[PDB]
Design a protein around this ligand. Structure first.
Ligand SMILES: *[C@@H]1O[C@H](CO)[C@@H](O)[C@H](O)[C@H]1NC(C)=O
Ligand SMILES: *[C@@H]1O[C@H](CO)[C@@H](O)[C@H](O)[C@H]1NC(C)=O
Ligand SMILES: *[C@@H]1O[C@H](CO)[C@@H](O)[C@H](O)[C@H]1NC(C)=O
Lengths: 48, 174, 174, 174
């Protein structure tokens, strides 16, 4: 939509946001992978 | 109508002529009716169809607008993109309208010549034998059959034989 | 002059003709002078005026240059903007010049047909009664009044009555 | 061929005519051959050469592509530059093709009128003296020398003298 309702829930800015949307025009598939699994942060606390 | 064939000499169309575009009306002893000659209407069909394709073929390469977005801090570029995209559309919509406007005039004028030249050859074949009335009508002298009308229709009008009977008909009215 | 009406048959214009564009010159027993027919010059006026407006109407949508400025560290964009703005002007100045160049030829050729077709109908009405000199002049046979000249002017030339006196004049010179 | 001069009346060209574009073929007692009139072919040469230069002269101002480079982090501008440069080329290649396509039709139609009007003036000079065959041939009556053919060629055909001998030849065949 022209005016999205749920965009960047937490306040802030997306760096090079328009640069990324240009790349999405040429990509037809996306897949999720476990680059850094959760529960692997034993020192810092991730859930809270 | 620059050539004047449409209106001018012949200002009335034939609603009964549905077989083709250009044809001849015969009113002789063996009835009357409308008939068509293929060599004239076929070239017009081929010429117009080639023109119609040519408009489509030439317009194959055209500007295609694409979406670009900016981050509210670069408005000179956004204005530059906006003025470029609609500027190209304005250029291309003028070419399409101008091309359509000119080719409409060509087709109407092209049809003028074909019927005009169709009249010219019939006058050039009949010559002294017939009289020119003014609305495209020819009134010949010889009392031949309907085949002579077809002879006019295939463009094969032999002059000499018909001249003697017609010249006997040029001296009895004079 | 493709149709050949300007120059060709009639190579000399009439400076005394200020009432209209196309007209007839009569030289008979009841004096001489120039007169105009409205049905020919009015259509030319309407056609040309429509053409003049059409050039203005079609050219309503055109590129409009706007000012953009850059900070001496972005010269690729400034060069891009400079080449885009003058590039559009170069495209649009070619369309305007080409349109004017072609429509100038149309008006001259359109005027050729109107006077040519005006000659064609007068020959088609007079036919055997008059003789064709070569410079557009017709020399008819009947000794009628100036109203017959007006009859030629309103395009209402009845043939039969005038044929008998003219054919008596085709046999006395032969 | 809108005017119909090419093909139509004269459907066969002359391979033996290499001196010029338009000319006359004479077949009389003093031999036969081909001859040219300069006033017709010179104007065609000047008109066509002016047209050829006009295409080059008008196309002097055109978009010139220039190289610009970007640093892989600004692709919206690179896409904008790429679409602008090839977009202008697409606009200009359409103008060049359309201009060539239309001016090709002009030259063919311009040549139609010149030979058509060349025929028209010869018919307008000979008139009753000759007969119209159909393929552009004129068969006059008077038994004059080859100079009369040149008289037709310089467009100076005095009518009266030749009328009396021809009218004596219009009454012996009738
Ligand atoms: C039609 O014209 C062609 C021209 O060659 C001729 O062969 C044919 O006989 C004509 N038709 C008739 C019925 O004569
Ligand atoms: C002019 O032409 C019209 C054509 O209908 C005719 O009614 C009128 O009588 C003509 N003028 C004169 C003076 O005859
Ligand atoms: C050619 O035409 C010109 C026209 O003025 C004339 O002067 C000249 O005598 C003509 N040529 C001949 C051989 O008569």
């Amino acid at each position: 939509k022209a005016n999205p309702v749920n965009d960047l829930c937490y306040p802030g800015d997306f760096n090079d946001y328009e640069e990324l949307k240009h790349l999405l025009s040429r990509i037809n598939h996306f897949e999720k992978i476990q680059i850094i699994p959760k529960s692997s942060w034993s020192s810092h606390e991730a859930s809270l | 109508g620059l050539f004047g064939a449409i209106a001018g000499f012949i200002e009335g169309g034939w609603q009964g002529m549905v077989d083709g575009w250009y044809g001849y009306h015969h009113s002789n002893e063996q009835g009357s009716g409308y008939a068509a000659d293929k060599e004239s209407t076929q070239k017009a069909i081929d010429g117009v169809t080639n023109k119609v394709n040519s408009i489509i073929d030439k317009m194959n390469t055209q500007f295609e607008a694409v979406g670009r977005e900016f981050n509210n801090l670069e408005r000179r570029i956004e204005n530059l993109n906006k003025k470029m995209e609609d500027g190209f559309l304005d250029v291309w919509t003028y070419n399409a309208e101008l091309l359509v406007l000119m080719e409409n005039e060509r087709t109407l004028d092209f049809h003028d010549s074909n019927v005009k030249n169709l009249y010219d050859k019939v006058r050039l074949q009949l010559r002294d034998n017939a009289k020119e009335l003014g609305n495209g009508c020819f009134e010949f002298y010889h009392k031949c059959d309907n085949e002579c009308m077809e002879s006019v229709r295939n463009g094969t009008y032999d002059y000499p034989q018909y001249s003697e009977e017609a010249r006997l008909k040029r001296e009895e009215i004079s």
